[PDB]
Design an enzyme around this catalytic site. Sequence first.
Site, mmCIF file in Angstrom:
data_model
loop_
_atom_site.group_PDB
_atom_site.id
_atom_site.type_symbol
_atom_site.label_atom_id
_atom_site.label_comp_id
_atom_site.label_asym_id
_atom_site.label_seq_id
_atom_site.Cartn_x
_atom_site.Cartn_y
_atom_site.Cartn_z
ATOM 1 N N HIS A 1 -7.784 -5.597 -1.169
ATOM 2 C CA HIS A 1 -6.513 -4.960 -0.854
ATOM 3 C C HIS A 1 -5.925 -5.478 0.451
ATOM 4 C CE1 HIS A 1 -3.360 -2.034 -1.051
ATOM 5 N NE2 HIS A 1 -3.759 -1.397 0.035
ATOM 6 N N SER B 1 0.868 -1.184 0.000
ATOM 7 C CA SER B 1 0.000 0.000 0.000
ATOM 8 C C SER B 1 0.905 1.235 0.000
ATOM 9 C CB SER B 1 -0.983 -0.096 1.158
ATOM 10 O OG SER B 1 -1.734 1.099 1.286
ATOM 11 N N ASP C 1 -8.638 -4.608 -6.496
ATOM 12 C CA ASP C 1 -7.880 -3.727 -5.620
ATOM 13 C C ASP C 1 -7.974 -2.298 -6.138
ATOM 14 O OD1 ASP C 1 -5.050 -4.465 -3.619
ATOM 15 O OD2 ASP C 1 -5.876 -2.464 -3.957
#
Length: 266
Positions: free
Chosen positions: A255, A142, A197
């Site tokens: 995610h 991330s 995602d």
Amino acid sequence: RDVSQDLFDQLNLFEQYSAAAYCSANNEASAGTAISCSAGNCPLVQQAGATILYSFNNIGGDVTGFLALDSTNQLIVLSFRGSETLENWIADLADLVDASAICCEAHGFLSSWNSVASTLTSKISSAVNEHPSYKLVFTGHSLGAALATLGAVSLRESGYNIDLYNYGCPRVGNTALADFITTQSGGTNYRVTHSDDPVPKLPPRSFGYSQPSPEYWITSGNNVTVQPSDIEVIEGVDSTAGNDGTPAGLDIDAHRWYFGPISACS
């Protein structure tokens, strides 16, 4: 379609490194302590004997992660952590700055990077002078994933051979920056995406952002064990296939899942 077992294991190892970047025990830990993950978030590196060389927490944005040594696999890993409040972090995620130091221009990401850059580069130089026969790897998930990618593209100016392993990485710069990351003779690049995602989709490509290639996109869903048969390689830079080909939405649980819950140790 085109992925081996050992390369799949390498991808899992570096995703578990990025997950260990979330463990608050691995962050701001005294140098010399081994890597441990709560709820076995990274047993493949926890059993690989990786020692913390340095652990950083909140320096600069929220730059958090660790530089560790791995003599079982012989490599030095700098793993960045994402955001503790990821749902507040994806909200304010779209300004662009002039990053012609590599050029073509990048995104906060480069801000936090160039904030921690001199110190982390000094520590990386010390670590690679320790073990010149070890491979230098930058990784993250991330936000940290972005901090990894730029973190590599700014250190290959010198004679640094760096391999990159990002998981759920957002977009950092323009199309020229994607082409530059794609064509670079200072190590290989592994960009990993997963299903719906929305983090690799943001910031939107309409606003000038673009992501490099190859794209290692897994077809497995959320909270499901993955196999190499579910991983497809995408060659076109800024391709509308794989993750970027998935429709719009906010599958945050997609995610959360990258070979396991990569963000569940903080």
